[PDB]
Motif scaffolding. Structure first.
Motif, mmCIF file in Angstrom:
data_model
loop_
_atom_site.group_PDB
_atom_site.id
_atom_site.type_symbol
_atom_site.label_atom_id
_atom_site.label_comp_id
_atom_site.label_asym_id
_atom_site.label_seq_id
_atom_site.Cartn_x
_atom_site.Cartn_y
_atom_site.Cartn_z
ATOM 1 N N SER A 21 0.821 -1.207 0.000
ATOM 2 C CA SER A 21 0.000 0.000 0.000
ATOM 3 C C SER A 21 0.864 1.271 0.000
ATOM 4 O O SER A 21 2.063 1.248 -0.290
ATOM 5 C CB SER A 21 -0.999 -0.031 1.174
ATOM 6 O OG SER A 21 -2.128 0.779 0.866
ATOM 7 N N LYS A 22 0.218 2.396 0.310
ATOM 8 C CA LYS A 22 0.798 3.724 0.472
ATOM 9 C C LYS A 22 1.204 4.216 -0.905
ATOM 10 O O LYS A 22 2.377 4.370 -1.243
ATOM 11 C CB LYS A 22 1.916 3.733 1.534
ATOM 12 C CG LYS A 22 1.462 3.133 2.874
ATOM 13 C CD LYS A 22 2.455 3.437 4.003
ATOM 14 C CE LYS A 22 2.030 2.662 5.255
ATOM 15 N NZ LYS A 22 2.586 3.235 6.494
ATOM 16 N N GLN A 23 0.186 4.344 -1.747
ATOM 17 C CA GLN A 23 0.290 4.483 -3.179
ATOM 18 C C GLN A 23 -0.774 5.491 -3.573
ATOM 19 O O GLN A 23 -1.968 5.184 -3.524
ATOM 20 C CB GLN A 23 0.126 3.104 -3.845
ATOM 21 C CG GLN A 23 -0.134 3.248 -5.358
ATOM 22 C CD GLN A 23 -0.025 1.932 -6.131
ATOM 23 O OE1 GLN A 23 -0.516 0.892 -5.709
ATOM 24 N NE2 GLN A 23 0.623 1.929 -7.287
#
Length: 70
Positions: A21-23
């Motif tokens: 994640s963290k996109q």
């Protein structure tokens, strides 16, 4: 009873350790209208002999000595 239920082992092998994640990096620009030989051509919107143009010479073109950006 049976064996060898399918084989589809040539299509890849996945990409582990490559997703966490963290996109979110959206962008926004004038794309789909650019030339393939454009070097400062249509891009001199200021008069000759005013300070707006001396800043324009800073950018110069689509590329200049200005540090890496992306």
């Amino acid at each position: 009873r049976s064996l060898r239920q399918r084989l589809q082992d040539t299509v890849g092998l996945c990409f582990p350790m490559r997703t966490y994640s963290k996109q979110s990096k959206p962008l926004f620009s004038n794309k789909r209208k650019i030339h393939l030989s454009e070097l400062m051509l249509e891009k001199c919107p200021f008069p000759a002999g005013s300070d707006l143009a001396q800043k324009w010479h800073l950018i110069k073109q689509h590329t200049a000595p200005v540090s890496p950006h992306s």
